[PDB]
Design an enzyme around this catalytic site. Sequence first.
Site, mmCIF file in Angstrom:
data_model
loop_
_atom_site.group_PDB
_atom_site.id
_atom_site.type_symbol
_atom_site.label_atom_id
_atom_site.label_comp_id
_atom_site.label_asym_id
_atom_site.label_seq_id
_atom_site.Cartn_x
_atom_site.Cartn_y
_atom_site.Cartn_z
ATOM 1 N N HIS A 62 125.101 115.011 45.739
ATOM 2 C CA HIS A 62 125.981 116.208 45.609
ATOM 3 C C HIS A 62 125.841 116.946 44.278
ATOM 4 C CE1 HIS A 62 128.258 116.018 49.277
ATOM 5 N NE2 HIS A 62 128.050 114.687 49.196
ATOM 6 N N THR A 94 130.910 125.467 48.454
ATOM 7 C CA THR A 94 131.423 125.734 49.827
ATOM 8 C C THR A 94 132.464 126.850 49.829
ATOM 9 O OG1 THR A 94 132.849 123.884 49.501
ATOM 10 C CG2 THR A 94 130.787 123.524 50.789
ATOM 11 N N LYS A 154 130.829 126.080 36.003
ATOM 12 C CA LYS A 154 131.321 127.095 36.960
ATOM 13 C C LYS A 154 131.674 128.403 36.220
ATOM 14 C CE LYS A 154 133.149 123.459 40.097
ATOM 15 N NZ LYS A 154 132.722 124.014 41.405
ATOM 16 N N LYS A 185 133.367 130.140 52.403
ATOM 17 C CA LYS A 185 134.676 130.456 52.947
ATOM 18 C C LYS A 185 134.968 131.949 52.818
ATOM 19 C CE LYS A 185 136.081 125.905 51.438
ATOM 20 N NZ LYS A 185 136.922 125.137 50.526
ATOM 21 N N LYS A 187 138.320 127.402 42.322
ATOM 22 C CA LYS A 187 137.443 126.202 42.258
ATOM 23 C C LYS A 187 137.942 125.340 41.089
ATOM 24 C CE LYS A 187 133.924 129.052 41.935
ATOM 25 N NZ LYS A 187 133.034 128.537 43.014
ATOM 26 N N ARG A 188 137.572 124.057 41.067
ATOM 27 C CA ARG A 188 137.939 123.194 39.924
ATOM 28 C C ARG A 188 137.492 123.917 38.647
ATOM 29 N NH1 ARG A 188 139.695 117.920 40.885
ATOM 30 N NH2 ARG A 188 139.783 117.856 38.605
HETATM 31 O O1 KVE Z 1 128.302 119.079 48.467
HETATM 32 C C1 KVE Z 1 129.697 119.319 48.305
HETATM 33 C C2 KVE Z 1 129.995 119.767 46.862
HETATM 34 O O2 KVE Z 1 129.952 118.609 46.017
HETATM 35 C C3 KVE Z 1 130.380 118.936 44.690
HETATM 36 C C4 KVE Z 1 130.456 117.621 43.896
HETATM 37 N N1 KVE Z 1 131.495 116.778 43.742
HETATM 38 C C5 KVE Z 1 131.194 115.679 42.969
HETATM 39 C C6 KVE Z 1 132.061 114.683 42.641
HETATM 40 C C7 KVE Z 1 133.408 114.655 43.068
HETATM 41 C C8 KVE Z 1 134.256 113.601 42.704
HETATM 42 C C9 KVE Z 1 133.768 112.563 41.893
HETATM 43 C C10 KVE Z 1 134.582 111.493 41.510
HETATM 44 C C11 KVE Z 1 134.054 110.470 40.701
HETATM 45 C C12 KVE Z 1 132.721 110.496 40.264
HETATM 46 C C13 KVE Z 1 131.910 111.562 40.647
HETATM 47 C C14 KVE Z 1 132.435 112.582 41.457
HETATM 48 C C15 KVE Z 1 131.602 113.624 41.833
HETATM 49 C C16 KVE Z 1 129.910 115.643 42.541
HETATM 50 S S1 KVE Z 1 129.155 116.995 43.110
HETATM 51 C C17 KVE Z 1 129.306 119.902 44.062
HETATM 52 O O3 KVE Z 1 129.598 120.134 42.647
HETATM 53 C C18 KVE Z 1 129.187 121.231 44.910
HETATM 54 O O4 KVE Z 1 128.074 122.086 44.513
HETATM 55 C C19 KVE Z 1 128.997 120.886 46.387
HETATM 56 O O5 KVE Z 1 129.177 122.098 47.182
HETATM 57 C C1 PLP Z 2 136.398 124.674 49.461
HETATM 58 C C2 PLP Z 2 137.226 124.161 48.361
HETATM 59 C C3 PLP Z 2 136.684 123.736 47.135
HETATM 60 C C4 PLP Z 2 135.225 123.854 46.798
HETATM 61 O O1 PLP Z 2 135.020 125.188 46.239
HETATM 62 P P1 PLP Z 2 133.757 125.569 45.308
HETATM 63 O O2 PLP Z 2 133.932 127.029 44.963
HETATM 64 O O3 PLP Z 2 132.529 125.265 46.144
HETATM 65 O O4 PLP Z 2 133.842 124.715 44.053
HETATM 66 C C5 PLP Z 2 137.548 123.254 46.191
HETATM 67 N N1 PLP Z 2 138.876 123.163 46.394
HETATM 68 C C6 PLP Z 2 139.410 123.545 47.552
HETATM 69 C C7 PLP Z 2 140.885 123.417 47.736
HETATM 70 C C8 PLP Z 2 138.608 124.050 48.566
HETATM 71 O O5 PLP Z 2 139.187 124.420 49.747
#
Ligand code: KVE
Ligand code: PLP
Lengths: 809, 809
Positions: A350, A649, A547, A653, A541-542
Amino acid sequence: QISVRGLAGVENVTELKKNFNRHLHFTLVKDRNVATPRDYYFALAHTVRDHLVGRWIRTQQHYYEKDPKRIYYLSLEFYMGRTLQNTMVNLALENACDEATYQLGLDMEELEEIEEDAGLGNGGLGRLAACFLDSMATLGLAAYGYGIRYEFGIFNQKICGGWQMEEADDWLRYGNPWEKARPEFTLPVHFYGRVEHTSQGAKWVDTQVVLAMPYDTPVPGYRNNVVNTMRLWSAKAPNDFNLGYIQAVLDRNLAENISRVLYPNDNFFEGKELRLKQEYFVVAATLQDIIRRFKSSNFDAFPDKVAIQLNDTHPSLAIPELMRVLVDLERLDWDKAWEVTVKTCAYTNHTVLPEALERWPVHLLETLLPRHLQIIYEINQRFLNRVAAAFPGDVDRLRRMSLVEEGAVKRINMAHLCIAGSHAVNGVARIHSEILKKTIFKDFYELEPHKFQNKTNGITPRRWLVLCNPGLAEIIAERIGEEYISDLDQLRKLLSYVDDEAFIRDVAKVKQENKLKFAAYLEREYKVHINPNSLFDVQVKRIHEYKRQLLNCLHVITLYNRIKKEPNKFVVPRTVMIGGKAAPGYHMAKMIIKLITAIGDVVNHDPVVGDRLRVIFLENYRVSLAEKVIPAADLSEQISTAGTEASGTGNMKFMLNGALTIGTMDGANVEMAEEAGEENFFIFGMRVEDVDRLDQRGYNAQEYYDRIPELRQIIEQLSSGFFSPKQPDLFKDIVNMLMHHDRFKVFADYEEYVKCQERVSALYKNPREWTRMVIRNIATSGKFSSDRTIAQYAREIWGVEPSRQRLPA
Amino acid sequence: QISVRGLAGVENVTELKKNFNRHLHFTLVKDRNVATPRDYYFALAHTVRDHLVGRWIRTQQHYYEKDPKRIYYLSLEFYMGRTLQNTMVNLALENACDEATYQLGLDMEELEEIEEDAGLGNGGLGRLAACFLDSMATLGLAAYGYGIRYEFGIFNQKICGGWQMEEADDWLRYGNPWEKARPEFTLPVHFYGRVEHTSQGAKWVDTQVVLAMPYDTPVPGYRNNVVNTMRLWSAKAPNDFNLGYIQAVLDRNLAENISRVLYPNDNFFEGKELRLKQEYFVVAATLQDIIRRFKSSNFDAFPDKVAIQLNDTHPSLAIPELMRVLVDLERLDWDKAWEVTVKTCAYTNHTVLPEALERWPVHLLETLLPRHLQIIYEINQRFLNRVAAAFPGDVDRLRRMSLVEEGAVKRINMAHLCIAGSHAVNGVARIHSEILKKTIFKDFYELEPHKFQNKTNGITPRRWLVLCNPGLAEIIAERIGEEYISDLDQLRKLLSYVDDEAFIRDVAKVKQENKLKFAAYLEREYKVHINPNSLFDVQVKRIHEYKRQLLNCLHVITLYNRIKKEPNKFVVPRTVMIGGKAAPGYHMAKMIIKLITAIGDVVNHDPVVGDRLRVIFLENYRVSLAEKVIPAADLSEQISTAGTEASGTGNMKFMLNGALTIGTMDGANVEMAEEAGEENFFIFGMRVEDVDRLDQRGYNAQEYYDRIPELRQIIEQLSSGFFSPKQPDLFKDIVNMLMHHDRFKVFADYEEYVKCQERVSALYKNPREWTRMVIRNIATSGKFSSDRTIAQYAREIWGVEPSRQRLPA
Ligand SMILES: OC[C@H]1O[C@@H](c2nc(-c3ccc4ccccc4c3)cs2)[C@H](O)[C@@H](O)[C@@H]1O
Ligand SMILES: *Cc1c(COP(=O)(O)O)cnc(C)c1O
Ligand SMILES: OC[C@H]1O[C@@H](c2nc(-c3ccc4ccccc4c3)cs2)[C@H](O)[C@@H](O)[C@@H]1O
Ligand SMILES: *Cc1c(COP(=O)(O)O)cnc(C)c1O
């Protein structure tokens, strides 16, 4: 009232009303005189759940009889949001429940707002898990979501003096009517202990036992009568646990802490034991369940009956755990168990951000999972023996590819373990999958090119169109029918309405209605006053440096400075809305929220500005707030530095919901621009190649500060306390980071961004050409359906065929 | 099948079957192919609960309209046991549910055995609370049980190598279908903080908040359609609590610990802060609720609308808390608030044992409830000012009567606070109430003779006859009809059947059937082999020195020694069954269990003994085991040292169920013997007066050891390791205590006990005269109905009139 919400028959409505009154009485033990809106929400929830039960039982039954190959989606995160509207949409009960509740004198929309989000995720990854479950049920796959039932999901975000405060998300306080406890499928999970080597192999002994108690939540497919299962494990002390007396009972809390709270880091690894316990807990309990189901049909056939998908490395221990069960308990030889494991497991990567990669210290695995560390060492030896034979003499390759990282503290690279132990490794957008093969997994690619795939991410058009934007769904359904909701590529038929005056007027009316509705929601719930005729510029987004919310901040201050310089000149009015949670210990992310609110405090109270520019921090961004603000958006801000957003994602949306995108050639932005055409996208900034060129020679932020007068002014205002009069140095860390330690090259994209934002304002001045470009976006958004994504997983990884054929009702 | 279990109509049975199948499907999400007995139990529970709901809502409604005076029974303990059979009995559904389940191919008795005991109590006091709730509902009083919903009730007792092991009673694991969470009536409880004195009075500030969340359980009256409420509070952290992030969420457990576990001490005070927190928690939340209800009708009328009964001193803080609310929050003057408090509160005293009296260190109250300590000091000053004026110059009286005890650590005497702050103080048997006036509360009696009452304890003949002994209920109902179940004095009509041959044969057949059924239950659940033609000699009660299980042990060893001395002589065969839990830190009680099992290991494996003498330790004595063993008993052992058992209630259960009593003139034994006639009771041992005479001159155990050869032999066998061959000195603490530090004068009663036990064996040799004496006991047991007890509380303390008139169905 609107057709895509289904029929309200006379019997259906009568039947819903009498079951609503039955539950208010027998289930809630209330009469109508003392019921609160929350009782009404619960009665309705129970009434809709009753339509799920027959289909749930028949579906699980049907999987027992047909014995299809079963898909196990292992994730530490399922970002579900609310269940009530989604259940009504997929069962076609929405109009009937609207009618049934209306006749009882209640407003169903008000009752929907009482449901807690199931916020068992951080953001992109967790929400992808939720969209996937919806698509697997809709595509009639025998699929199971497996995760942890956290007592506390992602924290509730309060803003206090423009600072983020975290409150515990106590989402189970009032009960969860959607879950069914299955105490009778409770399973032991083991921790600590030591390995004895006997005649009859290795034995894991003197372990501490935590019980895993499963809760099943139904996952309805879209009008196919399929209901799949999300099984979430809760930690429970065994009754002999600690067993002076009083403390022994109180210390049960130690074991149950494992399922207590979701870790709130988005793309950040924290090597905490409790996190490793959560990771083993979900893996150990899930694999026992998978094997139990498999034996109720010799492990040669296991991979013909089982696919296990790993959502990032979070459940990577599934690989050593499956080896441990097959070798130590089932007595298979190493090589046969390993073949079974590789053919069963598949790994979705990811992110490429180094600080996100899970690299667990060995001393932690040594204490907590002694046997797993032995099996990991054995995997590493056999793996590096294949590298050595394929690349003889390449000793540096051996170091780079090792599962074991040498250094101050030895670490296991969980990503390396996942590639070794999986028949397939995918990224989540084409550019991301390419970057995996060219950079971080180059060596693994060269050894096993056949393992590396792309599966571009998607979103469920049920939650993200029908549910959140019924008015857009309907005007689309008026021209091309309903079939597109489960076949989103049919949206291409809208390209032949790009010059239809009525359709152009309908697309624009729905956007205006969504904006009026959202503007009103802001005034009620958060006493703020936005002009609904402004362009709704939203970044949700977070909060993360990659970002580049900060790039957005620089644009906002640029617009402000330009208005003050020429007060009496026309500018397209904008409402700039930024929203996101910061990880509680992420100092810089917390400073960015404070800067956003501090710009707002200056911009929103300047008389010269008027309602030409408003800056709103959207508090507590979560799934249910995304359902409201995304349909209201004109401009989607997707402005990550090229190479940092694996996919995104949110971008999808907004494309689906009639917003134009301003973004970098990053993640799925690239495929979105290619689907719509580059002329229908506000693309700016460095490509991946340009960032690389900047890195080779070195990023000097001073160079941009020295050449861009408009940028120098912003930096001077930040430094001198223009935006923080009482604490002039409040933002020194921000200025200092942008000037000396910006990993994400915010200044490098500043000029091209502001210019591109001028092109946005120009198009917005021409409503008809704005709406025509919006139509070109909605009409090409079909690829970004999680139905396409899951069909690709199914055919190219899991080896199963999707189906849109209905089960009997 | 039997008439007192009600009608099984054709519609009723059809209706129960279809609601059972509805709940299996919609509530449990099971089909008949995968349902376990536990699912079947839950479906039935839900089906029976559905008959409670209408009556529950109508009853609470009716109390709102009529606005009667409301009774608040505050107890830290409600020993409820199982709810399913009790609910069926009181709703008259038992035969219909038997028939409905039978036709679905299930055995209702097997499903009843799957219900967990609600073991939220230790013994006598907790079970008196449960019998009282049943009687208040049956007598149509607007009564509320208020207590704590402990996550863990009284511990499960395992015997391991003849030693007690404690396991956590995880009674909520599978869900509780009887409770209804009321999250919307959640109330804050305050702790710690400090007192600010202002112009506008004292103010309790900087407190820690714990939330009290109530759970309502229905309490059905006997066929009157009345359903009262038991409200139990659960501790819940507020969502800002502690709010690095992860630990803050985990530390919520600190606050929730308050409702985690029942303290397992029977008649023993432990001054632990967590116990004081439980005591304030239930009092603070309950009084807010009582006042809220009262304001939904000026505090002059409060005592006309509210009675608060304190079950011992455990909720004594209700007195300062009511003062604090009336003075600090409602702004009444001291004297008016005090009048309201005294006229509202009444105190039931349950023991005279000094180690049981709650005497809280001041430093604990100082830290935790600063404001309550100030109000307690103010109560003490005004109280001692009245003592000084009534008894001028009597400074020793002032010291003896003070709420504040001087010494190493200052303590509050909670019993003194209860007498000062209550319009009525009662004991629980006539001899106990007399001892209160002559000894421990002599001074309080002399000041306010009008406050001191007796309310002799009772038991509900619903659970303790109809439910546990349907066959006895029926043969009684055959002669005198059903009306006695809610009017137990009608059992006197049985005295005219004392010479009826058929009735004598029926009483004896039911006893034999109960014994056969219990003998079988022992063989199944605990692989033990008892002769059902033996006399069933049972002592079941908490393990305590004062209850003199050890006296019983001495008799058992005496019988053993006599058999070995004359192997070939006839002795009436006995099964001696002793059962009880020991408090986990009560060393001596744990040694007595070990001695009991160690006698068993010798006696049960001696070939010369045969099935003439068996010794069984009944494991995990609890309410549901009492329902089985009490109907099977021939001889009830009530052998407390005169003056130690305040009342007892076991004694009553056995009298009702056709067992003869061997007992001391202690507690309600005295009133039982007076009701039946002394000639129908096996009375032995010191009276209260004799114990006093022994104390004046000094108890020398040596004197009995030196004069009773039979007793010397037992003591030598204990000392020399006859009963512990591998650890010869295992029982030195027992021997040493009986010889030098016996507070309970076990040797003083030994001779008179053994002689009296010979008279028991002699009567048992004559079945007809045994059964006639049993009839004389059952027939005079009417006084010992909790209906009589509650009618006396109602008329002489609460100022309300009971009613047996039905509410409409
Ligand atoms: O594929 C779905 C999305 O994944 C996001 C992503 N989330 C994570 C993510 C989340 C929670 C975690 C908790 C603990 C340790 C690592 C973690 C990593 C990595 S990458 C990515 O940052 C996005 O680009 C992508 O659209
Ligand atoms: C879809 C969604 C995300 C992911 O959004 P990105 O712009 O891809 O970081 C995060 N939080 C919520 C609540 C969402 O619905
Ligand atoms: O009136 C009901 C019965 O009450 C019994 C009694 N229980 C208690 C009792 C219980 C639990 C406690 C927990 C903490 C501190 C003190 C406690 C005291 C006292 S006296 C008495 O010992 C019995 O004689 C009597 O029949
Ligand atoms: C009635 C009862 C008691 C009280 O018995 P005593 O002999 O009065 O001590 C204790 N435990 C249980 C389970 C009871 O039912």
